[PDB]
Each structure stands twice: as structure tokens, then as C-alpha cells.
Amino acid sequence: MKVILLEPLENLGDVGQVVDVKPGYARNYLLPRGLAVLATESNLKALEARIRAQAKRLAERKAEAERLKEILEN
RNA sequence: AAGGGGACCAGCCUAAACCGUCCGGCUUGUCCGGGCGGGGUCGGGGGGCCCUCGGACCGAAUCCCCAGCCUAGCCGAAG
């Protein structure tokens, strides 16, 4: 089924990406070896929490920047 | 079996959303989930979260106290 990959993974995807596999792969390879995690509501969120948080931390980074763009070059 | 006639008669608590707290996980975070707490219980669909308005009567299957009752008994007419 669906999993959230914790690492980069050959022909599946980049970390954090959500890909769809056969459950045998997931349960006997991916999950045990901390390579991916099941795509449950409960960590489908932790995907987006990490996302939102990432977006905002960059937002301030382009904020206190825009300060240092008008206050500088001036 | 529905139905009709009867017996008895009684209706409730949660899960979830939302809020709070404590605890532990690592990826700190508007995170995730574990407990406890609040909130909620319905088929005129009900509940949550917001806006306005409103403004003591119920009531236990729980806890008391009592009557009554069971576990000995007693009085009891007239040759």
C-alpha cells in the first residue's frame, strides 16, 4: 500500500515522498529497516507538520531577509 | 411473523469531533500518541466549533433512615 519513505530510495522516490508498494515489500523490508513508514492518518499528518513548519521557517528566512534588503542597499 | 388481547413497565453510559492537562517518542512542534479530565450520545438526524438571544424544574437502577417482613415466641371463650 502507501508508505512515507524516510530515506532516498532507488526506484521509488526522495525522502518524505509517498509511494505505493506491495504490502510484502513494506512489512518485511521497508518498515523493519527504518527505510519507510506506513501511510497512516497519524503520520500522514507528520508529513504535513514537517511541511508547514518547513514553509514557515523559510518564510521568516525571507522576512528578516527583506528587512536586510531595504535596510541594506540603503 | 405481523397484528389483537394480556403481564410488566425504564430507560441509560460511552467512541468520535473540539478543549485542557500530565506523561514519552524524535524530526521540535500549530507535531505524533498514551493516560486522565471536560465536551458528546441522536433519527423533529444528532453532536462539535464559531455570532446573537434566552434564563431554578427534573432526578436515580447509587447512598442513607424508616415502615413492613423472615430467623424464637405469647394471650386465647365455655361442663
Contacts of A8-14 with CB under 8 Å at 24 or more apart are A9/A35, A9/A36
User: For residues A41 and A33, what is the distance between their CA atoms, to the nearest angstrom?
Assistant: 21
Chain B positions with any atom < 7 A from a protein CB: 27-33
Mapped onto helix, strand or coil, the DSSP state of residue A4 is strand
Nucleotide nearest to A44 (CA to C1'): B32
| Rounded CA–C1' distance between A39 and B47, in angstroms | 29
The answer to whether the beta carbons of residues A1 and A10 sit under 8 Å apart is no
Give A13's DSSP letter: B
Experimental method: X-ray
Cell numbers given for A62:
525571507
Q: How many CB atoms lie within 10 A of CB A24?
A: 9
Report resolution (Å) to 1 decimal.
Answer: 3.2
Q: Which amino acid is at A67?
A: R
Nucleotide nearest to A15 (CA to C1'): B27
